[PDB]
Symmetry: D2
Amino acid sequence: SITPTDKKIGFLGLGLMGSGIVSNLLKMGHTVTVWNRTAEKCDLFIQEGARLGRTPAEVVSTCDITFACVSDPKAAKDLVLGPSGVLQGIRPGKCYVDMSTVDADTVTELAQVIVSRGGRFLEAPVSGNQQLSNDGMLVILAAGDRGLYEDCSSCFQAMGKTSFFLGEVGNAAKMMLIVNMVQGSFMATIAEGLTLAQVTGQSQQTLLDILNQGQLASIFLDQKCQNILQGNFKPDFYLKYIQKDLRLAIALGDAVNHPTPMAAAANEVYKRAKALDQSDNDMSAVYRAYIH
Amino acid sequence: ITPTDKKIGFLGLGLMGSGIVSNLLKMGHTVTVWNRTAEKCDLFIQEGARLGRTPAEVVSTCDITFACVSDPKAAKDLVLGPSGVLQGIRPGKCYVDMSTVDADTVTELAQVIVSRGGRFLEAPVSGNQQLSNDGMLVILAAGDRGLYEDCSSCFQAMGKTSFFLGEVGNAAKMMLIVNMVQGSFMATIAEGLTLAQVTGQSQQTLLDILNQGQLASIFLDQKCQNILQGNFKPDFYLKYIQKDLRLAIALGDAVNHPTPMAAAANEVYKRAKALDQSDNDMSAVYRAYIH
Amino acid sequence: SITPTDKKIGFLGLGLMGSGIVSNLLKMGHTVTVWNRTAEKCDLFIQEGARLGRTPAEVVSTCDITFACVSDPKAAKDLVLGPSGVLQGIRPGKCYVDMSTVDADTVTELAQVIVSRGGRFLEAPVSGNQQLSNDGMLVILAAGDRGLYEDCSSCFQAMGKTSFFLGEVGNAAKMMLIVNMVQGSFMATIAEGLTLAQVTGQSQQTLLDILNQGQLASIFLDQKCQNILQGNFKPDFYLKYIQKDLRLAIALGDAVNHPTPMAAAANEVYKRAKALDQSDNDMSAVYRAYIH
Amino acid sequence: SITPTDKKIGFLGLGLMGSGIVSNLLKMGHTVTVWNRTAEKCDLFIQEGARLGRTPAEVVSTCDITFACVSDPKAAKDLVLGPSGVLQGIRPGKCYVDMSTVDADTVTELAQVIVSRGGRFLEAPVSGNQQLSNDGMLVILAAGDRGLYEDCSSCFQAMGKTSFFLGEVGNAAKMMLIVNMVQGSFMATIAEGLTLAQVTGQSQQTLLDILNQGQLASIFLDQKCQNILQGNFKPDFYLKYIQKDLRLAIALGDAVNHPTPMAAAANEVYKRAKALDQSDNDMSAVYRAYIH
Ligand SMILES: Nc1ncnc2c1ncn2[C@@H]1O[C@H](COP(=O)(O)OP(=O)(O)OC[C@H]2OC[C@H](O)[C@@H]2O)[C@@H](O)[C@H]1OP(=O)(O)O
Ligand SMILES: Nc1ncnc2c1ncn2[C@@H]1O[C@H](COP(=O)(O)OP(=O)(O)OC[C@H]2OC[C@H](O)[C@@H]2O)[C@@H](O)[C@H]1OP(=O)(O)O
Ligand SMILES: [K+]
Ligand SMILES: [K+]
Ligand SMILES: [K+]
Ligand SMILES: [K+]
């Protein structure tokens, strides 16, 4: 039972992940000011005891540590550099923790401008999904200002199962991209396997039973198969997110001349899925890219 | 479980067959063994097996004969070649092919064996050398249901569990899909660990993070530890996984179903074979990524 | 103007390619006996002066040189080894020229059985398309019995623009697969290019115009693009044939541990096209694998 | 023989392409001021009659139309926005023609800043290679300011075989990326074919001879094969440039949810070639990615 920090916490982006994080931060006794581009999404947290912030700039100005959890590099950059953005609220004292999954260049550029105005910066992307976020069981990958990482102890314990500190700014982005590349590629392979079973007159259910008896058995494999078997593609992690992470993972490899053919093939299947309107369903809807 | 009265034959004392036979003998079966190379049989005579001279004669001597060889080419040769399984079949004899082959091969072999009064069951196995030694294989069977039931004590000895998947052909198709998934995942894991290496990240830390995530599995952990220790001693030969990928793609071809993930994994494994990794563990595909 | 051989010529398989070959053989004054699994296809050559054969065995028994031109390895093997097949008509002296595109193992196995019964064997797969076949402008790739190659001079000159002799049985199969791999992969690339242009608001027509001004300009590129632009996918070379050739080319690489990723990718796109019912259209119908 | 424009012409970037362009501009009687980040590359051009500019800003300030031909989006952006860059020299009326191959977002961002200072902007990327640039036989793809395109008539005729005007800014970038995607993918395929031939005991020379008798015969196919057969990988078009164009083409497809699996595959082979130190050889050096 860790006791919560005195520090006034701000939170920007009440999305699929952010929403669960904030809940758990409030459950565990933190003082939190929330903001979201769409005001309506804040209502449920105001009810759980959050303060409603008017802009990112003002949230940062009011709070000691501000977390942000948005979708893209484009969104992360806009949140910081746009009008009434984070940067406008930064002064010596203020700390910003970016939990968005972006590329290392984005995180480096953002850390630089923030530090240039007297701020402190930590990247802390998260590995998990809506359910894990709601349950407060995310795996947190952090890099940057070590002191700030230690200040976020109670926060990371509320939102998370465990936390890794990976050194200098850039490293958490690089690792998160690799973790998600593995996840996204495996999902493509699972969907390829289930649809091959279907089409060759084999039982998908029996394929899953066999796989669960083997060495490859995992919570992920079982859960994503069950989704497909039930026809349930309600998003636990958005397909568009995983395709983004694959795209960026491939770019990381490009940057160091390292072929990533498995990721490259996965990416093209996910692009097909997006062309078939699956962007806002679960990543498991890549299954629809294989359907005849 | 009490072992069957039936005289059991076993052909092919390879990576998988060797463990199966050991477990059959441990659990009290009467077993006659044969292997193209005679020397591999010596340990098994010491563990109580009878030495068979030819596949034909083992089949002729035994009630149920299991075979476990590498390829479709080897499975076909073992049955159709001189002193092969077919020459020993007569009304009532039973053959259980545990090799991983394509559906056409298993169909062709079933048909010739049945045509001479034999009974046929396909029972490919999912696992590796260690699981085979431990008697913890997952068995996928298809064909003659009565023969499946007769193999009860044998399957319980060699296996953790068993599936019966219906008509001949279905176990082949399923096994290829299972292995396609495994093979493609291994290519992805290798791609992930090498990308970590080359980008200044810790491979060990990558594994630690993956082990805290939802993707944590015995397979993931074991195969990563192999790579991290530089240990590519074969638990499942790389050449076998590339064979299975090749056949899984051929299965898809037959029903016009693209398998691009498999296709990509297959080319990586082909590269590994060109770098002389065929007789190492499937995890040696890691070497196809090394700069 | 080359004077036609005395030899009685047989021809098995009056398909997309075979039909034009036979026409040109008759135009140039050869005595030809034709056979086709479907008897009705042989009618067209009655007025052109062909004799109608009843079975492959009988055609081979009657003729000095018998050409075959069928679709797959399966078909080539069945034509030889099935009931009243080519093998049953072979006796010392008889000559068989297989013009089907198959793998080297198939041609090797077929050559061996035919020679075992006193026959002579040449493989002479053809590069071209229905139009070139009709015009007598095929490129012929031959391997095997050199004497038989020289005996086919007048036939090859009738049906072909030019001919290559590539040595021992197996070599023409291997070369033909590589030629078709290149062609099939290129066609996938062209379709990828035209569809990307469409979807990004560029003019397909102008893409072609630019390509025709560059160093890549070829009859093939122009012709297949004009098909796509006109929506005309009437078969000049069946899509299913090109996918078969890609499949086999990948198998050839497999056999010598040589990755063929470009072919592997092309092959998966062609399989998609087949799932979308394009098997019997032109290979350019792979375009429909890209359509949103 | 067209009469050269009165206008003072500036040229930035005397690389593989720029060098030939400038030589032809001078041959055809234009007044040209040249600049290059490395000063020494300008020396030949003073002999051939060019004025030596000190900075990009100053060249733009001195000239009526300034052409730029640099490697990357990163280089194009730095050339314009860096210290003493193009932007610092722009004033109402001045014209900039960017001939670098970049993505549409880069060309858009650059056109906007230049126009914001009263400049006029045209994108005019070029299709060809060092030899065609030297011969003045490039294909020019232009988009943006139509008036400026017409003012460049003498320049484009000196440096080019032909020119296309594709409309609004962005369109030339998109088209160029597609053209290069096709070229780059095809080169990968050709390399795959020649190496497969090698490894399976066939003659690469004979493969080329057969292809030259077929419908796929092109200057490109012949030239790139002859390079490989002679072991001559001296750059006509840098491999790094073709891999950049493939990467950007794939990014273009990402942007509109269009899978480009052929490009994706080619890109991974080129990345392997870069990992084998082939970046500064001809694009045909992708051959070395296949060598056992
Ligand atoms: N033509 C022929 N005729 C008779 N026997 C032959 C023939 N070819 C190989 N073999 C035998 O099969 C065994 C090869 O299997 P191994 O490489 O150990 O691999 P595993 O046991 O790991 O593989 C078993 C299956 O499970 C999975 C995998 O995909 C396989 O299908 C070995 O005992 C061989 O005899 P030898 O005399 O010792 O060389
Ligand atoms: N940051 C920066 N600032 C100023 N100048 C720079 C910069 N970076 C590179 N460059 C210059 O770009 C030129 C590139 O030359 P080259 O490699 O021969 O390329 P090519 O002519 O072969 O290719 C040109 C384009 O055509 C198509 C292709 O895709 C390319 O986009 C070269 O003269 C460089 O100057 P340097 O001092 O000589 O090194
Ligand atoms: K927690
Ligand atoms: K057991
Ligand atoms: K002719
Ligand atoms: K010119």
